[PDB]
Design a protein around this ligand. Structure first.
Ligand SMILES: C/C(=C\CNc1ncnc2[nH]cnc12)CO
Ligand SMILES: C/C(=C\CNc1ncnc2[nH]cnc12)CO
Ligand SMILES: C/C(=C\CNc1ncnc2[nH]cnc12)CO
Length: 144
């Protein structure tokens, strides 16, 4: 059955700057901040927001060589974005279901809380969450 893993991190960045890169401007950023993992990101379908489909192409040494993700939730007013893996990635490594939901909140002008919810069924969320948190901290440094 689908289980959940929740974690969070506070980043030293403005909410709106983090929201823009997280939710919309990530296509050139992911390969720049995860160059050991992601070769490029392709927009497959959609124009942003719900129903958008993405391909993440990994480095040649990586198997599976890609992951297909879909934006399943998008809410500007609450700064929430959810992405479901629909092909490849962790689904090729024993997961039957995998979704990541990010929610941003303002703590102070230059401090933003990121809540991370991973929904999964069957590679553990303890480990996969570390990768997701590393990505978030990399967005903080990109923006700083
Ligand atoms: C494009 C975005 C995230 C890309 N997807 C993932 N980003 C970070 N950790 C993950 N684990 C599985 N899928 C992901 C939001 O900027
Ligand atoms: C539709 C989205 C972004 C629009 N920007 C890009 N859309 C498509 N290809 C790209 N290459 C670099 N930036 C882009 C994701 O919200
Ligand atoms: C299953 C694999 C990678 C999992 N996906 C991700 N792993 C780490 N950071 C990411 N950003 C976007 N997608 C990812 C390839 O071994």
């Amino acid at each position: 059955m689908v289980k959940e893993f929740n974690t969070q991190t506070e980043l030293s960045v403005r909410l709106e700057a983090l929201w823009a890169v997280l939710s919309k401007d990530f296509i050139t950023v992911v390969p720049k901040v995860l160059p050991h993992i992601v070769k490029d990101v392709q927009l497959i379908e959609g124009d942003g927001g719900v129903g958008t489909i993405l391909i993440f192409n990994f480095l040649p040494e990586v198997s599976p060589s890609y992951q297909r993700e879909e934006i399943t939730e998008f809410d500007e007013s609450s700064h929430e974005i959810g992405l479901q893996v629909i092909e490849g990635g962790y689904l090729s490594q024993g997961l039957s279901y995998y979704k990541t939901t990010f929610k941003l909140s303002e703590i102070e002008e230059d401090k933003t809380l990121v809540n991370v919810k991973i929904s999964y069924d069957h590679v553990t969320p303890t480990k996969t969450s570390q990768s997701t948190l590393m990505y978030l901290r990399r967005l903080e440094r990109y923006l700083s």
